[model samples]
Target: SDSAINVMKWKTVSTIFLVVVLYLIIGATVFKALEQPQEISQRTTIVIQREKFLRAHPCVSDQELDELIQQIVAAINAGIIPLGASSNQVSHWDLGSSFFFAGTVITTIGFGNISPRTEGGKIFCIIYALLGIPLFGFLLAGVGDQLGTIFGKGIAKVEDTFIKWVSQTKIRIISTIIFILFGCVLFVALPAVIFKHIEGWSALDAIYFVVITLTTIGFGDYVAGGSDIEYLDFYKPVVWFWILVGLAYFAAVLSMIGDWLRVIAKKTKEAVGEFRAHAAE
Candidate 1:
């Protein structure tokens, strides 16, 4: 009865592939809608400010100002602050930010918020990522398996309380979905609310940040604790642990859905085989 699982797991994998395709379509649509308007206004404001500065200073040539702007952009991209006015700026190489960077490296997020621009650091990261990615994958997989087992026990208990009239597997799948939703609230929604309060993001932006991070999208656009304000010492470290747990939860959910699809495919294929047998006879 259980022999065909490997045969149809490809089905689940492709199903999930299509799911990701649609998810990205929606992600792009919403993100573009919200971000495009702000982008135009911000661009216009900067251009106006530059024009006003140039008009006030007839001594500075246009090419000189362009040269200055070019250098500032270059330094900022290379992880350095070029301007002298930001004396109180926080260092990205500080212990907390480095820890966050290290976590992102191993998790395969590679946020690109900060990077090793030097020869030694860049070479070090390439080697470090090659080694750390597999080890961290092992950690996530082990923890995810345990979480799946733990939830299986709970889902079984809940499924037993129902009357036996309907399909038991259907109930199993639905309850697993419920369990996943519960974790969504715990790991995602609840944390988003806290992020909204502390990070001064809108509710939607907070949710987007969590989704982008936990999904390992790593846009580096809405970074946590990176504002020009004081931050708690423990914030980024705590966030690393949250990323660990939430990533495990997501992997477990994917595996559960894969198995559910395998179960359903097993029955559907048997019926198709029965019809084929009649045609062959």
Candidate 2:
């Protein structure tokens, strides 16, 4: 009987394992991998054509292109120096180096420096974000709760200030709506417009970029600091600092809205229960 039970357990586990493997293969091959080579080639050609056009344009000075190329080379070299500041270990691509860079980029702890070159790398990136973004949010909220608790006192003070301003239920509702609007405008709309100009991205692309960055999905599709522009590195960290601060601010404001809604729901439920009891009596 025990042998039979063991065989049953093994069969169940094997079935589950096969199902998971089949799912992954289907997802990667059909959804993620379809037309990948063609897509990659097309993207590369577009970039090359753009480059050639820029070079042909006398509007862009030769000196400017030379300077930009030099800057790109320097940035690449600086990224390598940490592995060995002096050793001939430069221009190497080991597993450790790849792993380290991938981790940093995906985490949006994006040191704004190093990046992948190959089409395969970019495809892996899109797949990683598709799977990992929500998982990252789950982790962030888990960690953020503890951090919020530690800073609960300050949060309470701010909440009290908001409550003081809300003299009535009407005021509370108005204030909540206004606050949400402000978040949409300042954190979402304004930033999207600014990033659009800064990154030379379309409005739709910029909005998508801002939303993803703020939510920490951070797919690295379009970013401020990731530009190959010279001297941009000096300002990139500061830009990211503000971006993160705005994300935190909006996140807190939304959390407050959620708390308000929850409290109101609970109170309404209690009142309804009390009314039903009185009617029954």
Candidate 3:
């Protein structure tokens, strides 16, 4: 009977993951189907275009490199990027990628995939830097406060008619834990599935990138739909939203924990005060 009852507990943990695993696989499969041609186009667009470039310039011998060395020095000094014109690449300054750049700037992620080359853009960025950083800080706090207040409502409502004799602090502890897990799947895990197929990266690599991005780690080793591949118009705008809200969620998470820590610390001080009062009596 005990063994049979234990099977129910096993099912509880197993069921949660069972659905979640299916959730991600279904997600990956959907994008996989959508991006099949994009992957093949990547092969066709790149390899075919590459042979065209290589055919014209067969080899650069060490002795022939003498003339080439001066050209390389001239180009570098001019701040010219190699393959600037050859590759049929999308503009880094396009609407979506530009939004990503702005997100990185405000959030202080600063991945540096592309930076201002012109003197005008550099000076503009410097002015925008002072403007956006403080604005983002203000919004992060505003967003964090609202989320906590909503959670506070949950705590108040549920504690009224809910689980009996549970510790008040424990309710919030569980609430925050659950919210983190929920958001992890929503903002990080699910989005990674789309990246997995579209970016032609492995599931683990995709997840690694989203984790880094949402955490504002911004290593810039990998980015979504980067290089010469075609991209969905809304794709990066969606990611920018994810980055914005995900960081806000983290701000909320930190605020809740800090509040809890202060309360816990206050208990210790109050206990010490009571001990002092009794001794004086």
In terms of TM-score, the best-performing candidate is: 1
Candidate 3 lDDT at 219 equals 84
lDDT of each: 0.82, 0.65, 0.75
Candidate 1 Cα lDDT to native: 0.82
173-241, model 3: which lDDT tens digit per residue?
Answer: 677666878767877788889898778889899988876776678787787756556667577667776
Clashing pairs in 1: none
TM-scores of the models, in the given order? 0.75, 0.39, 0.58
Measured with C-alpha atoms, the lDDT of residue 188 in candidate 3 is: 76
Q: Ten residues in a row with the worst lDDT in model 3?
A: 73-82
RMSD of each: 6.1, 14.0, 16.5
- 85-127 in candidate 2: lDDT tens per residue? 5566434345544554554554564543456667987788778
10 residues in a row with least lDDT, candidate 2? 225-234
Residues 1-281 of candidate 1 have per-residue lDDT tens digits of 56599668878689779978999999999999999999999999999998898889889887889999888888887566555786556688887677777788999877788888889999999998999999899998888878779877887787777756578567766785688789999789988997898899999999899888888888988888767565675666677777888888767666777888788878887988998889878
Residue 59 of model 2: what lDDT? 89
List ranges where model 2 is wrong by over 4 Å.
Answer: 1-167, 230-238, 253-281
lDDT of 1 at 131: 97
Clashing pairs in 2: none
Clash pairs, candidate 3, are none
**Shift in Å, residue 275, candidate 2:** 18
